[PDB]
Design a protein around this nucleic acid. Structure first.
Ligand SMILES: [Zn+2]
Lengths: 93, 59
RNA sequence: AGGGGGAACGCGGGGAAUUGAAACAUCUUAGUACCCGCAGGAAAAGAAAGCAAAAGCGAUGCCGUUAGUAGGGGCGACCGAA
RNA sequence: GAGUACCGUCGGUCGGAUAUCCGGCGGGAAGCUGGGAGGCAUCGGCUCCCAACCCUAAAUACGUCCCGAGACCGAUAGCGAA
RNA sequence: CUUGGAUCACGGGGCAGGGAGUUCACCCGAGCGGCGAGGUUAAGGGGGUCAACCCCGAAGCCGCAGGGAAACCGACAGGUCC
RNA sequence: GGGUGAAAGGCCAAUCGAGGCCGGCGAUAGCUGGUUCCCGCCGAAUUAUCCCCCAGGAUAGCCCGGCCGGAGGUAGGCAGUGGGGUAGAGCACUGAUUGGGGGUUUAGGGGGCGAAAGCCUCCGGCUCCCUGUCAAACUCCGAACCCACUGCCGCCGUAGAUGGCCGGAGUAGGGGGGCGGUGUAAGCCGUCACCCGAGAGGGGAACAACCCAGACCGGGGUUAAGGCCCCAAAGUGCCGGCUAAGU
RNA sequence: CCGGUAUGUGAAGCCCGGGUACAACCGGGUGAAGCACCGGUAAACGGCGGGGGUAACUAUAACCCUCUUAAGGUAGCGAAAUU
RNA sequence: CCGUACGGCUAACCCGCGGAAGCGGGGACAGCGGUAGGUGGGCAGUUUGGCUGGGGCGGCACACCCUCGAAAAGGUAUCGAGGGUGCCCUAAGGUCGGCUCAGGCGGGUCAGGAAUCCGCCGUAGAGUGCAAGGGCAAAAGCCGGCCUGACUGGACCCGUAACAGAGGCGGGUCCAGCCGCGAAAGCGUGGCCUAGCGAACCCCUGUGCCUCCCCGGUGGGGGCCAGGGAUGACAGAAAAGCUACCCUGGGGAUAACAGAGUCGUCUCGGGCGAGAGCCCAUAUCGACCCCGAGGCUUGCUACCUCGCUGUCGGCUCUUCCCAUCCUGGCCCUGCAGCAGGGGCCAAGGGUGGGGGUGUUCACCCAUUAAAGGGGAACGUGAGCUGGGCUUAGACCGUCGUGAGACAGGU
């Protein structure tokens, strides 16, 4: 499925219609400074059976996109609607 | 499970223990302490069968 | 000079599983049952390198509240002070 | 008042959570112009204290015994045992 | 028990004695009673004819103001109709 | 969870695929058994969704007790305003299905006068007329019947309707009878909501649910279902006809 | 199972850089065993199949190539305590 | 300046001789302590789902959409019938304008002509992004132009789930904001309508604000709103097997087992008449198609019994039925006689002995008047036997990594 690189849409910060660049969100790993990770690490210590579920082999064949739209005037980004599923995703002019 | 024979041998029971009380003594050389350079001499008195040596001993 | 004995109460160490979570592994049962050592008519604690917060208090122990609160926790079942 | 305060890592325990206490291992001070605490760590102020030695009654817990009492049972009951 | 018991479905030789919704903690309601924008004491103290009785003790808890994760903000004691 | 075993899971004080004694321990179980006086008022359910759920639970539905409120409600019927596509019927669409005629004559194999796809026929398709048949997943048609609403009749209701709040439950194996799908059938799965379950009495010879009929107590009468030769209360009843096989 | 090996991967620790008035934290490098790689071993566990075709008339595939796969049941025994 | 390995040494440490002092050998290795990775059924704790005409193998009726079932409002189940979805698309999305399809016939190309050219008829017999049903013609279809309303902040309502309760998920009617198309009115919150999807805790990203224990700063944490990362057993555990050494609690809610029901199958028959029989349907035989009885074979079902008895066969003992094998009496014949076929009445009496096999049955032998067949809880274990079958021991073959298993053999 083809998709444009730029689109004219409403900007909630400027409160008018402007041209927006389309970007995909890049995932990143768990931060060690976070409280959930602190708790996981302090419950993984010592003599203990594994304390949490461990789902291996859990991968939907098709995922929803996570798109962001960045304005050229204001420099800020937002999201536009919910995400839709499709295997192929090309950005074109 | 249950134990093996070689595991039961390690605990040291009569079923696995050597009857050394039946044997002639241990066979060892005289110590160097007494043989600094003295070169003692001896004479054989008797030849004897030992049940724990696979070889005959001499006194 | 010591050893041994003494119902319950006392001090210091070692330490489960049934069970509940409608299965179960973190958890719970539980610092529990049981085990080892050491004292007395009471033992232990005890005279701030503390608590607090623009005000101040003045060793320790016990009762009533604070409170099923702060907080912990497959943030589930539950646990739980000052 | 030194292998101490403190730093890191492992194990246990705690409501103690990046902020509970105990222990092992590796490092390791100042010491009166000195030192510590104030719930993540560091900086500056303000407040409060002086560890790493010792002793201490009363207010409390119990009842193998003793005294007194009872909307307790009344010999298949009441402690197993009148 | 069961859709279904006179059943070839289970329990049933006779008599007398024993024998099964109890206590605590929190919560939701009600039938009565006291005080009432306020209500109520706990531990404990004093007195006495000394476990009954009388007088103190409002610490705390609930209610009179709510909304909000929080910082924070902060309302008719009566205008009209059926 | 150790011993011993020329190995059989054999033996370890009548106890062994992990001894015996006491303790944890009044372990736990959605599974089985039991649960103590009388009368009186009311009175069910086994069906929807969810649960490692199917011998168990929760949320609703169906019962009971109390209160609020204050003027209507609707298990039946009549007339109307609208809705529907079943039974039946039929071929107007989709698909099937006999045969005889009138045509184009052909995409196409056998071909025949084919001096070679050929002009002519020829078995074949398609096109109108007859003729004979069909449909759970067809319809040019189309009931009885059911549903919603308005008005009226009827019935209930100020001795308190529709409704609302508070509280206490039980029910999560249903069965007979009628209808529908399935199945050789018996049976399986649903549906209606009359009965049994939870219902005495009078009859069918006896019969859970077929017929009459719903029950405080003591009495007197008339009928119902059915019956009237004896068993057995009541007719060896009346008129016309049939049967000769104890049918 | 055993042995060997250049490279690769590989935890803590150590080093370098960035960051933090210090730390927590981020990226890279090095990094033993083991894994990977290369070889030996069946009186180790185990395996010993497939076809597409047959020379002289009735049956023979008894001989020879093949492509599947590490290889393709040898001597003996056989309706067997195995049919 | 930091490391790593190689060589050597002795004084720590270790081993041996010793009554001890000391001697000899090894040696900064080992051993001991702390920490980090691997291997590890040697040892433990657990899990190994459900529906199901018993259970298992099989399948998914375990999440969704359409038609029939389904009974002309609504609602209605079965391992009921017929099928589909777990996507795709920057256009197949929005709007404006213009146009009209399939097929057939008549002309012209031509192997059918697959398609291009011409005219006419033609209510859709076409097409729609994809199943089925429904909708649609100056269109919702075809050809083109301009666009991104496939948007932000928010309300109310309907369905999943009637009546009668719901987290999450779909959908509908609108208010504001900023925009697109269009002359304008008007339409536009994805796809003509109905499928294409998912809790809590935790993490990632965006954006502007609140907050961290006496106060103020810095780094780093916690909070509110929005979008993504998954659980198909699809209202969401992190998860492999054997028991024939097996135990506990239950179940006739559920099999083997006899009984009840049923009779497809089984045993025994009938009707009609194609024919075969030298000719002649019917001495005898009798197709195809139709109608039955019995309950003695096997199946189907699951009403009865889960410690009633759970067994097959044989021996022994008694009794009944007739659909009659012999014995008594009759009829027809393709009955000369001797014998044979077929049928009627009759159940009084008879129906035996042996070989192999656990056998019933079937097969064979010699006799015989003939050596019939069934029922009685597949008659009969408080009558016998114990050969088979169906516990615990053991061997073979095959299957399995293995523990093991085999309506296979011993
Ligand atoms: Zn902008």
């Amino acid at each position: 499925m083809k998709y444009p690189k730029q689109i004219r849409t409403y900007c909630p910060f400027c409160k008018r219609h402007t041209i927006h660049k389309v970007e995909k969100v890049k995932k990143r790993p768990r931060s060690e400074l976070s409280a959930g990770q602190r708790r996981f690490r302090r419950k993984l210590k010592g003599y203990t059976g594994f304390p949490r579920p461990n789902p291996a082999g859990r991968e939907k064949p098709v995922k929803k996109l996570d798109l962001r739209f960045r304005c050229t005037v204001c420099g800020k980004a937002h999201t536009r609607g919910q995400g839709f599923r499709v295997k192929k995703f090309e950005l074109v002019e | 499970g249950k134990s093996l024979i070689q595991q039961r041998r390690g605990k040291g029971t009569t079923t696995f223990r050597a009857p050394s009380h039946r044997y002639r003594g241990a066979v060892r050389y005289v110590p160097l302490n007494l043989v600094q350079e003295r070169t003692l001499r001896g004479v054989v008195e008797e030849i004897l069968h030992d049940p724990g040596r696979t070889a005959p001993v001499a006194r």
